[PDB]
Amino acid sequence: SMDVFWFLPTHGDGHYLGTTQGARPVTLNYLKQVAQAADSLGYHGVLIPTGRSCEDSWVIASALVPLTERLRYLVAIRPGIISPTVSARMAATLDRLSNGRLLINVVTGGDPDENRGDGSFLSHSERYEVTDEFLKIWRRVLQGEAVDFEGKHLKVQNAKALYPPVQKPYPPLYFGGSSDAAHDLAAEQVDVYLTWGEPPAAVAEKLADVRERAARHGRKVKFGIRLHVIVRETAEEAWKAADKLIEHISDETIEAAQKSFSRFDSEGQRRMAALHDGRRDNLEIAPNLWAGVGLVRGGSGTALVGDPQQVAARIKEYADLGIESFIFSGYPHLEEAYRFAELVFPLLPEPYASLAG
Amino acid sequence: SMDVFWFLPTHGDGHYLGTTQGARPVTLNYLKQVAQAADSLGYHGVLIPTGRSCEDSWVIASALVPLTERLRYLVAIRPGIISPTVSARMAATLDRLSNGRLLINVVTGGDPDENRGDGSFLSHSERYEVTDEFLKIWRRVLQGEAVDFEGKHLKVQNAKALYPPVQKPYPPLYFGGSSDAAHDLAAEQVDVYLTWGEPPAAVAEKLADVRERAARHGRKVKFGIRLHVIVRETAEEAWKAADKLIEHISDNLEIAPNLWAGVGLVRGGSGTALVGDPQQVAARIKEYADLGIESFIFSGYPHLEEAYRFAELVFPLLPEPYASLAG
Amino acid sequence: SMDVFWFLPTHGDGHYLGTTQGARPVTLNYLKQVAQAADSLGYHGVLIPTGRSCEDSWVIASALVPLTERLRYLVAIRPGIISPTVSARMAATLDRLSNGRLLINVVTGGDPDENRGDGSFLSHSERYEVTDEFLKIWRRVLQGEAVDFEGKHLKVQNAKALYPPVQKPYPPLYFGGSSDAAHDLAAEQVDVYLTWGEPPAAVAEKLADVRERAARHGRKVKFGIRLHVIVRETAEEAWKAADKLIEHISDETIEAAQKSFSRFDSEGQRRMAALHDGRRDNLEIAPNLWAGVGLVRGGSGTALVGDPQQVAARIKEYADLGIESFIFSGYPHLEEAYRFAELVFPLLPEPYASLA
Amino acid sequence: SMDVFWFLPTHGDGHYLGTTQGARPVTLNYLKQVAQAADSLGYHGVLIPTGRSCEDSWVIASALVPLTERLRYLVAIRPGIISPTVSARMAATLDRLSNGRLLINVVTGGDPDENRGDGSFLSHSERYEVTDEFLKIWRRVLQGEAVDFEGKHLKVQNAKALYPPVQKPYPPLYFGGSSDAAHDLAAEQVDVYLTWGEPPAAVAEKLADVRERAARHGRKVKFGIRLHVIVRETAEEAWKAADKLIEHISNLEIAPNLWAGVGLVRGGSGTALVGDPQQVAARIKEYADLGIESFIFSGYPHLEEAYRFAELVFPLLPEPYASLAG
Ligand SMILES: Cc1cc2nc3c(=O)[nH]c(=O)nc-3n(C[C@H](O)[C@H](O)[C@H](O)COP(=O)(O)O)c2cc1C
């Protein structure tokens, strides 16, 4: 089993990273282009990022749902900045309008300055206490229960969501995080645990950690991975495109990005930014696992670079560890969605093998 | 100048009040029908209600924005249950995707049981304190400022909205409320003050109160009214339809000439309705307009059929651009 | 089995017949309203009329196909004014974009003045010769054959439709006509024979004719009926609305419009006007069958008027004669599509009973 | 004035010519992609080809009209296979639903085998006689006249179009053709004369001919050109992409930057502008100096290359195309 997602660039798009040259602004029209492309090409869904640098995830996802037929939308909720009952009603309404195409990404917020901008003044442990109480209220209200809950951070009395969702018991919960609080939270409440594009050995131990903690709770969780991809017909064209992607990045721009990630109280960003020491040389940290993307962009940090057979082999490597969800992205997102679907889909398991043609 | 709104029945629709007979459930398809009808007929916008009995307003408004061309959306934000910075980013995205067709309805929440369900445990006095601090943060972030604010209820540091809205300085703020705290809040921060369909004498005194307080802040606010409408070609058919609307209801409803309080028997949209022929309905509208009312938010049962009825019977009797739309 | 269609008013729409009062002009927005209404309410499809008084059928149906999900479109082809090969390519393209939601209505043209405006100068017998040769080419090209055909009117050499249709062997052919030439054409080539709303006795004899002629060709055809509908919650309200529909109808426009039918070369339009003759009194030619629509409108001329039980009872009577397709319409077309679907659907067979 | 069009690949699309490798089949979803791309990027319109190898132009153009806001559609009418009165009603209906975004491309048909498949058995001279009579009826019915016309090929009596078009007097007529009959037909009835991508010397001679014949009829016509385009950031990548496009086929540069490789197989245009943005814009300015105001471009594949041209060449073109990128 394999689910292949794409990515909506709700923070901006272009041909190069770091520079504003060749930039492609995010508009309703361009978001329709990328979303309808993923829908028509046969992707399972698209991941929509959240944060201060993005347009709002819920407004975007609701606007594109009536314009697509099969595509699913992985939309992020952020506990601590919105009431859980209200968030559940939003999930229910959007899940009903799409007839069951909504997926939820639990995001705790790794930037304390951004959290303070939203009014949240919580430590790392407190963000996960809030998220724990948030998910318990959210999951139960979507199951029709009138929820009474008085915790350390959240308190609701007679919380109800009158419109039940289409997917049962609730829209599936996807979650990413590398700290101990995150691995405990994922093992207890979530349905799919997400990890960034670390080398296969490092992801296998994280999976073994989350999988063991889930067994002590009597649960089993599925796993997913987030990766950029730069695939061409030959390996030579791929590595040239990886070089060209980061050509217009001054050495001073690399250092300023490597030090703005150090303010993030995020263990996931800690590891992803530790794969590269800002060095512009030797960015290939593993066979066909380039790390030059994380030189300037937050969030994801690595990319699969190579020919179609090389990229499909790395996907099978992650899949043999138990990973069943793959969230890909590329620059620019419209052109590269066609590139991946035409070069890599026939090399993937069904139904992606029979989609190309 | 006059703005005529319609109403999106996100809490459900039907032919009769009280009964589940003739009920029409809220789906994407039926919401598309009413909104696209209001867009093509030439209504200025639609009011979208909020509450535990409604689907979420922001999901609905965002889903209908790419399907319409000129229709505006009056969407409700509720302070106390969402961060003001997050609320502003949502307003910016919807205003940008709609190319300036977003309108904001400030709702404080009047039902304490429903507020307790969302996690807010505030008195009536505290609910307006939160709204006051909410709107100050909300207005400033949408104007490009990096906002630092420490109040009695809300606290933000370095709050920014990185995407500026289309409408300047921000999407217009519509607000309704009868308390003294509401009239002070309206005079200081809001752009359009809304009132229910009370008789003309009662509406004139509320307007004079807000208008006097607004002058002390060196500003002027516009006024709007919310009214159900049951208009037919003759006065006899209109009152017959009003009786049919409330037939399956358990035990004098005309509080003013052609102002019927029948639609207030259940917690639906409003509480009073204009009932009569086209000349009678336009005469009551002109009476409210002479008091300073410029926004009219109408509704009917069911909302699709009645949107066409009002636009074809009353629009030619209203000022421009509504006179030249019917043709 | 039963298929219930609605009607797209590409003629124009309104609340009353004869007068421009309460008129509702045909726009893209309003056609989107009616089509999306029929789509969401669960109608099988919509019939789109053709003619000089209509916007083009193919442009409208193609524009609404990407805006609807399940609704089917009964679109008219007119042999004699367009090449059959091109017409087949048009059908294939629209059937592919809709993923198998195209239906074809063969229209031969009953108005000779309108036909001469299109460049066709054919007698009644010749219009059916052209249509017969047209349909033979059209059906075969859509089945993948490179067709050579030399007839009395049409000639093609190496006619091919490179893009195959979704529905096999081709989008179903619906046809209406009352002449003897029409009954032969329907029995030989078409899939569904359509008739206007004549009384049940008269439709049974027309059905018995086509069904007997079809057996001699080794075929069987299904049957459909076209009717207006004025249904309300009570029978008194229905007849009150039927009266109001024709209130602004003067005796001078009855002659001016019904004598326009006297020039039509149509046999289905001849027996339609034979039910009223312009007399406004006594328009209920059968229990709940009311011919007031035919007092100014061409085409359909009768309407089912009554309460939901009465209207559903007349529908079951037509179904017992072998009729499986019902094409309904109402004034105005948006409001009345909801009225019929909410008052009559729960009384009809599945899937219309469980749709609400 | 300058109008820049794109191209809807209703005959099929792909990455390479000759081989089925990298082929992209024509579907509703992919046609929506190309059309909505042209709409958002700011192209004046798209040309839709016609013929036995294409899906029907009128079904495609009508299906995309409600899904776009500003993009215009250059749709082909074919005299001899459809009634002119019927053709005018189609044009009127589509022009009204689009609120004045319809453009008409009159095509007479150069392939006689395909014409016999449609039921037309006419010589070259006869196809232009029919088109002459077709356009006279078509133009007059769209202007509200009750038309009586009896010619060698067409006959109508009381031909009327009850729904008037949005654009007056009618949707503009675009026409392409190189024969003596074609230049006469263009000089008398059409609004824009179209030419293939020949070198500037050859295009100037055809333009001077049509313009001379039009002056004797008291008319003036505008001119347009059809060209494939392979533009990259550098000239080396452009010519390498030109090589890759035609490698799987069993030198080719006919003029400065005018590469005739795309003409080895039929599929829109026969020559292509190949080079960097300054080279491509210089040839565009060179053709514009001859009087050409409409430019119909295409690329392989049509989605990706529509963005490439709009992002690399638009800032080098006159307004409003210079100010669209930002
Ligand atoms: C696949 C994936 C997607 C994520 N998306 C977002 C996002 O959209 N916004 C965000 O603020 N954080 C995002 N994160 C980061 C986490 O949600 C979380 O905020 C951060 O890792 C802090 O948790 P930690 O300290 O346990 O790593 C994402 C993480 C992963 C693995």
Ligand SMILES: Cc1cc2nc3c(=O)[nH]c(=O)nc-3n(C[C@H](O)[C@H](O)[C@H](O)COP(=O)(O)O)c2cc1C
């Ligand atoms: C025109 C108008 C529209 C309103 N819309 C809503 C609504 O959609 N949802 C809601 O919960 N309350 C709505 N309200 C009520 C508000 O919550 C209002 O703050 C409430 O009446 C409490 O104010 P008050 O105590 O000063 O009267 C509306 C009020 C008015 C006048």
Ligand SMILES: Cc1cc2nc3c(=O)[nH]c(=O)nc-3n(C[C@H](O)[C@H](O)[C@H](O)COP(=O)(O)O)c2cc1C
């Ligand atoms: C259901 C139905 C739909 C029809 N639709 C059309 C139409 O759209 N345009 C038209 O000219 N005639 C239409 N007709 C009439 C016939 O196609 C034809 O023009 C007329 O009946 C002449 O045939 P006849 O003399 O054999 O009866 C329709 C007939 C029926 C029964």
Ligand SMILES: Cc1cc2nc3c(=O)[nH]c(=O)nc-3n(C[C@H](O)[C@H](O)[C@H](O)COP(=O)(O)O)c2cc1C
């Ligand atoms: C810009 C342009 C576009 C054309 N498009 C088409 C088309 O879509 N289909 C077609 O069959 N012919 C097309 N043609 C060819 C002409 O319609 C015409 O049939 C051809 O030039 C033969 O006529 P001639 O003898 O005058 O050269 C096009 C020509 C030009 C210049």
